[PDB]
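Exercise 3.2. Students should predict the tertiary structure of the chain below and write it as structure tokens, then compare their answer with the key that follows.

Predict this chain's 3D structure.
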Amino acid sequence: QTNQFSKYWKEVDMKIKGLLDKLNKSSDNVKKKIEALLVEYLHFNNVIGQ
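Answer key:
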């Protein structure tokens, strides 16, 4: 409704960067959880991007 897309797009991009930095630094059990969440957060980025 507002068309905030730029602000929310950049915001989510950081979220993904966050998740990836922590992905590298994290145990193999939560590694799977974090890669799993990225698959979904990436799609958020992709749609807001579209």
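Discussion points: The radius of gyration is 12 Å. Residues 4 and 50 are 13 Å apart (CA to CA).
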